[PDB]
Amino acid sequence: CADAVYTCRAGQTCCRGLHGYGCC
């Protein structure tokens, strides 16, 4: 979830979404 890191940086965690990668 390299891309998710962008938004995740704000204050979220990297989880396994329906597709594969997604911030919680």
From TrEMBL:
<feature type="disulfide bond">
    <location>
        <begin position="15"/>
        <end position="24"/>
    </location>
</feature>
<feature type="disulfide bond">
    <location>
        <begin position="8"/>
        <end position="23"/>
    </location>
</feature>
<comment type="similarity">
    <text>Belongs to the granulin family.</text>
</comment>
<protein>
    <submittedName>
        <fullName>Granulin</fullName>
    </submittedName>
</protein>
<feature type="disulfide bond">
    <location>
        <begin position="1"/>
        <end position="14"/>
    </location>
</feature>
